[PDB]
Each structure stands twice: as structure tokens, then as C-alpha cells.
Amino acid sequence: ARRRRAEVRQLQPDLVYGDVLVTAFINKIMRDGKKNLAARIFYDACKIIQEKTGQEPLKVFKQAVENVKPRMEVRSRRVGGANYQVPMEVSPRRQQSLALRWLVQAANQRPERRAAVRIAHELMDAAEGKGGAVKKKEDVERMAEANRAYAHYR
């Protein structure tokens, strides 16, 4: 907006752990207003996380989000007669938004039949070092690194 800065929306902490990050992840999982279905998907994923890699599901979730978070990103910009991918920093809020969006998208790209297992498998994949979301983050950061010459064009 031209006039002012947008005021961020304060989500309500979830009624199982009191964590707003869980609420944001559920909102990213949800579509068409089906909030109960999204919450059940997340909690089934949490149960499967409890079975395999029997550590705390919250710990695995937070580790996945921390692993997927990107520090650099390229933004397009036309100067003269050429378009340039200017590398720029990422604010922590956008870091969280990108991490959650990439996690959900990568989970939905997996070929497992049920969604509740897709989310859990993607979460424990991103927990250690792997997954589609980690690959996306590496691609983005590599693109930002391969454009350090244009860091003055911002």
C-alpha cells in the first residue's frame, strides 16, 4: 500500500501446545475454510512423528522450519534493456512465511496416498538435511549467491 505499512495479523496460539507457529502451519495446510480437517491432518502427522523418530514432535517441527528458512532471495528488476535478479536479504517474518509455504508444497508433491503421512514424512525429512523444501531453499540461496555482482542494483 502507498500510505502506510500493513499491520501483521496476530494468530491465536493453538490449543494443544500454545504455539502460533503450529497455527500458521495449519492455516497453510488448510484450504476452502476446512480448518478442522487441516488440524486433524497436522495431528495425525504429529502422531506418526511420535512413532518414528520418537523425539518431541514439536522439536522435529521447529527443526524442519529452521532448516527450510532462507537467508537470501533474488528479486527481478528491469534496468535499461535487461532484467536483473538482484539478491536481497529476507526479513524473519518472510523467512517464516517462505519456510511454511515451501514445506506444505513439498509435502503435497510427495507420492504417498494419504496427506497425513505426506506431511509427517516431509517434516522429518526436512528435520535432518533432506526434502523437497530444503532443495528449494538451496536453489534459492544458490541463485542469490550467483548474482552477487548485481548487489548494487537495489
Binding site: 552477487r148 555482482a149 548485481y150 548487489a151 548494487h152
Partner: protein, 114 residues
Amino acid sequence: QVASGRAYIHASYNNTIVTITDPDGNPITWSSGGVIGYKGSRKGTPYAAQLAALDAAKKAMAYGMQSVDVIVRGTGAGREQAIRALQASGLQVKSIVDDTPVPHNGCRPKKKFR
């Protein structure tokens, strides 16, 4: 071999060329924006000049040199960056001098410069 040398920085608007010379001006090694895999207008960026200066200084240390006097010619974009990269590469920078050649109203410039 010598531990004291000279650093010439030639920073045009299209490229930055760095040469390390012995105290008699005979070059030991050199590096430019194209020596690192850059072509075109990217050779003129400050970051390319920083990389070229770091590469030339690294080769100079690989030869066993420790201090360089810096001479800067030209007013390109990568001038200050190359000078700073030399300052923080592992070489003692005793002095920096500006020596860009300017005529005392000599030859007629090209049309683009008129």
C-alpha cells in the same frame, strides 16, 4: 622473489585490471574481471573488481610477497572496492597513490567524450 612489491589498479568503466610488480615495475602476476569467469558488463561491477584484486593478491602471496604499494589509475566503479580488498587480503598496504593520466589540454577526445 621479493617481499615488497607494487600494486597497479587500472579501473576503467568496463573492467578492472590488477597487476603486481616487483620494485622495478616488472610484473610478477596479474588478474582482471575476465580472468574470473565474467564477461560483458559484469566485468565492470564492483564485486568483479573485488574478486580480481583478491585473486591477484592471492597469487602474489603464493609467490611469497607480503607488502605492496598501491597505484590507482582510472575512475571506474570497482576502484574503491579493489583498493579495500587489497587492504584486507593479507598484504601490508603502506601507501595508496592516484596516478590517473590526464592531458594538459593535449589530443582531441573521441566524439563520445566531447
